[PDB]
Amino acid sequence: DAKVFGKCEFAELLKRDYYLSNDDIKNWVCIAEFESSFNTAAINRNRNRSTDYGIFQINNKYWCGSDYGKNVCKIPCSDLMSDDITEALRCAETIRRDTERFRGRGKGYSAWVAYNSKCKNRDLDQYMAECWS
C-alpha cells in the first residue's frame, strides 16, 4: 500500500525533516490535501496524453520524465510517486520557483489548480489550527 499521510502528519513531516517555514508548510499541506488527499501514489491520466504524479500531482509535459514533453526537474516521474517525498518536494519548489519567475513575486503556487480554487487568499493559519493548536 502506497503512503497516504494524515494532514497533521504531513505538516509535522515538512517541519521535522525538511525545516520548512510555516508559510511553506500551510501552503504545501493545503495543495496536497486538494490535489491528492495526501496520497503519494495518486496518478491522473489526462485527455491531452499527459499524466499528473504523486501527492503534488506534477505533470509529465514540463516537470518530470525523459520520454514525454520536457523534464525541468530532471527526474523520472516515478520518483514523484514514492513513500519518500524528498523529490516531490524538491520538484514542487522548482515549479514554485519557475512560476514565480514568470508570473511575479508571491505567485509561485498559482501553478496548482487546487491552490487557485482552495488555498489562495484563505486563512491557512485557521486551516492549520487543528495541527498547530
Side-chain angles (χ1 to χ4, degrees), residues 100 104-110 115:
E100 174 155 69
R105 311 274 150 274
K107 307 233 327 190
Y109 298 110
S110 72
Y115 174 80

Short mmCIF file of all heavy atoms in Angstrom, two decimals, residues 100 104-110 115:
data_model
loop_
_atom_site.label_atom_id
_atom_site.label_comp_id
_atom_site.label_asym_id
_atom_site.label_seq_id
_atom_site.Cartn_x
_atom_site.Cartn_y
_atom_site.Cartn_z
N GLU A 100 6.96 31.62 -10.13
CA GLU A 100 7.17 32.96 -9.53
C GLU A 100 8.00 33.80 -10.50
O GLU A 100 7.63 34.96 -10.74
CB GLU A 100 7.83 32.83 -8.16
CG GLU A 100 8.21 34.17 -7.55
CD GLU A 100 8.31 34.16 -6.03
OE1 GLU A 100 9.24 33.52 -5.50
OE2 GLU A 100 7.44 34.80 -5.39
N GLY A 104 5.42 36.59 -11.29
CA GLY A 104 5.65 37.75 -10.41
C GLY A 104 5.76 37.30 -8.97
O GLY A 104 5.33 36.15 -8.66
N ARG A 105 6.31 38.18 -8.12
CA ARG A 105 6.58 37.91 -6.68
C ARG A 105 5.31 37.34 -6.04
O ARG A 105 4.25 37.95 -6.22
CB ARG A 105 6.93 39.19 -5.91
CG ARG A 105 8.00 40.06 -6.55
CD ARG A 105 9.41 39.67 -6.20
NE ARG A 105 10.26 40.02 -7.32
CZ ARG A 105 10.48 39.26 -8.39
NH1 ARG A 105 9.92 38.06 -8.49
NH2 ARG A 105 11.27 39.70 -9.35
N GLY A 106 5.44 36.22 -5.32
CA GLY A 106 4.38 35.62 -4.48
C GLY A 106 3.33 34.86 -5.27
O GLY A 106 2.32 34.48 -4.67
N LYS A 107 3.54 34.63 -6.57
CA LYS A 107 2.55 33.92 -7.44
C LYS A 107 3.01 32.48 -7.72
O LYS A 107 2.38 31.82 -8.56
CB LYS A 107 2.31 34.75 -8.70
CG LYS A 107 1.92 36.21 -8.42
CD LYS A 107 0.65 36.67 -9.10
CE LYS A 107 0.42 36.01 -10.45
NZ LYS A 107 -0.68 36.64 -11.19
N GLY A 108 4.01 31.97 -7.00
CA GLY A 108 4.66 30.66 -7.26
C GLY A 108 3.66 29.51 -7.22
O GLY A 108 3.75 28.59 -8.06
N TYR A 109 2.71 29.54 -6.29
CA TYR A 109 1.80 28.38 -6.08
C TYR A 109 0.66 28.37 -7.11
O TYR A 109 -0.05 27.36 -7.14
CB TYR A 109 1.26 28.36 -4.66
CG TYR A 109 2.30 28.22 -3.59
CD1 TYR A 109 2.60 29.27 -2.74
CD2 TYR A 109 2.93 27.00 -3.36
CE1 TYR A 109 3.54 29.13 -1.73
CE2 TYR A 109 3.87 26.85 -2.35
CZ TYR A 109 4.17 27.91 -1.52
OH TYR A 109 5.08 27.78 -0.50
N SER A 110 0.52 29.42 -7.92
CA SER A 110 -0.58 29.57 -8.90
C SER A 110 -0.44 28.53 -10.03
O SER A 110 -1.39 28.41 -10.81
CB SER A 110 -0.70 30.98 -9.41
OG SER A 110 0.35 31.32 -10.29
N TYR A 115 -4.54 25.11 -5.69
CA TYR A 115 -4.09 26.33 -4.98
C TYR A 115 -5.03 27.48 -5.36
O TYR A 115 -5.50 28.18 -4.46
CB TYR A 115 -2.62 26.69 -5.25
CG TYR A 115 -2.25 28.02 -4.64
CD1 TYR A 115 -1.96 28.14 -3.29
CD2 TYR A 115 -2.28 29.19 -5.40
CE1 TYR A 115 -1.67 29.36 -2.71
CE2 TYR A 115 -1.99 30.42 -4.84
CZ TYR A 115 -1.68 30.51 -3.49
OH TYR A 115 -1.39 31.72 -2.95
#
